[PDB]
């Protein structure tokens, strides 16, 4: 029963690929719903559009702020900003997804997709989903970022929604 989301990623607009996500719910419901709610668009805004305007290669892709597009950006659906709901699951390695925050339950629609293991982050970042299908995908979008996360070419959620 746990969703499973995509997104249509694509590079200065030209399709790189679809890459599905499994999200946890059966974990981390609370902040699975909010990244699958803001993946279909459902409650009127959501992911569709925005870019990932952070990159850092050998360690993880960031995206999310829909409101801002720099990392400022983004909320929840369910209000500003949420707590962090637990710390079941560990940044095991690459594929793992994860909200991005600024301390403890500041959770807001921002995350990143890890490219390794990156578990001084367990314990500080919640973990919801991970890749599942087009990890290669992800691995090409490393390629547009930098050591300090600038990117080098706008990487765009062209679509988004849920397959189940």
Same mark, same amino acid.
């Given at each position: 029963?746990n969703?499973?989301?995509?997104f249509?990623?694509?590079?200065?607009? &030209?399709?790189?690929?679809?890459?599905?996500?499994?999200?946890?719910?059966?974990?981390?419901?609370?902040?699975?719903?909010?990244?699958?709610?803001?993946?279909?668009? /459902?409650?009127?805004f959501? $992911?569709?559009?925005? #870019?990932?305007?952070?990159?850092?290669?050998?360690?993880?892709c *960031?995206?999310?702020?829909?409101?801002?597009?720099?990392?400022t950006?983004?909320?929840?659906? $369910?209000? &500003?900003?949420?707590?962090d %709901?637990?710390?079941?699951?560990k940044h095991?390695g690459?594929?793992?997804?994860?909200?991005?925050?600024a301390?403890?339950?500041?959770?807001? @629609? *921002?995350?990143?997709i890890?490219?390794?293991?990156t %578990?001084?982050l367990?314990?500080?970042?919640?973990?919801?989903?991970?890749?599942? &299908?087009g990890?290669?995908?992800? &691995?090409?979008? /490393?390629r547009?970022?930098?050591?300090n996360?600038?990117? @080098?070419?706008?990487?765009?959620?062209?679509d #988004?929604? *849920?397959?189940?």
């Open positions: 029963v969703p499973t989301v995509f249509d990623i694509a590079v200065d607009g &030209e399709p790189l690929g679809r890459v599905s996500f499994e999200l946890f719910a059966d974990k981390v419901p609370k902040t699975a719903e909010n990244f699958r709610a803001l993946s279909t668009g /459902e409650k009127g959501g $992911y569709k559009g925005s #870019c990932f305007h952070k990159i850092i290669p050998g360690f993880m *960031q995206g999310g702020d829909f409101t801002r597009h720099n990392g950006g983004g909320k929840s659906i $369910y209000g &500003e900003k949420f707590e %709901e637990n710390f079941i699951l095991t690459p594929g793992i997804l994860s909200m991005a925050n301390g403890p339950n500041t959770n807001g @629609s *921002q995350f990143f890890c490219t390794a293991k %578990e001084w367990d314990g500080k970042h919640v973990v919801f989903g991970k890749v599942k &299908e990890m290669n995908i992800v &691995e090409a979008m /490393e547009f970022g930098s050591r996360g600038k990117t @080098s070419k706008k990487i765009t959620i062209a #988004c929604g *849920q397959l189940e």
